[PDB]
Design a protein. Structure first.
Length: 223
């Protein structure tokens, strides 16, 4: 997160860190056994880390649970990043509490102008490289489809939306991938892609979660 703020420990209780020897992506806990992330975060040997603030220090509220299965969306295209969504099942159910909690799926899509919270342990620099230990947060509005398409000609599908600031300075970044965009207490987006970070006229692009609720529910119901 570039141009954000320190969230505060366990203030984003649905935020997970995906770890394969090191943090590599964010995710969102959607029930005791399931995490939603980006398809471009797919790899084998994933441990889901819940209740994290400082990802380099065991602070006492963590739960570390290995993935038993990952399910990349059947229509994910890694070239265009269309359908950039994946489900991860935990080997055992997380113990839910005030600091480890699921986030609700949307019942409808959120409109341009809606204020959202984007979070993660990604790069905090727009030019350089600096990775934080503690969770960073950014309040950002959803941008109009037209402005999103104008920013990225030929690249925005119906499964994507832009959020952030066309002036730059405030954005998600490398390592925030797969993490949450939460608006009005619903998971509306997944950190997906962009062109660099916090650059003028290059806002963050996010997987449009409301398009996938049926797939998520049915997949969970049979797996
Ligand atoms: N600024 C949007 C964004 C989201 C997720 C990742 C990246 N990124 C990947 C490499 C460099 C930036 C950007
Ligand atoms: Ca920790």
């Amino acid at each position: 997160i570039v141009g954000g703020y320190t969230c505060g420990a366990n203030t984003v209780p649905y935020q997970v860190s995906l770890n394969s020897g090191y943090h590599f992506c964010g995710g969102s806990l959607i029930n005791s056994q399931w995490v939603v992330s980006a398809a471009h975060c797919y790899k084998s040997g994933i441990q889901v880390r819940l209740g994290e603030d400082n990802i380099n220090v065991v602070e006492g509220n963590e739960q570390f649970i290995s993935a038993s299965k990952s399910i990349v969306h059947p229509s994910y295209n890694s070239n265009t990043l269309n359908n950039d969504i994946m489900l991860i099942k935990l080997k055992s159910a997380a113990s839910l509490n005030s600091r480890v909690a699921s986030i609700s799926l949307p019942t409808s899509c959120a409109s341009a102008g809606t204020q959202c919270l984007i979070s993660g342990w990604g790069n905090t620099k727009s030019s350089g490289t600096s990775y934080p230990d503690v969770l960073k947060c950014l309040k950002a509005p959803i941008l109009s489809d037209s402005s999103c398409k104008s920013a990225y000609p030929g690249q925005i599908t119906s499964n994507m939306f832009c959020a952030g600031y066309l002036e730059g300075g405030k954005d998600s970044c490398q390592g925030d991938s797969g993490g949450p965009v939460v608006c009005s207490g619903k998971l509306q987006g997944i950190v997906s892609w962009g062109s660099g970070c916090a650059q003028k006229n290059k806002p963050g692009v996010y997987t449009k979660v409301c398009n996938y609720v049926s797939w998520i529910k049915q997949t969970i119901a049979s797996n």
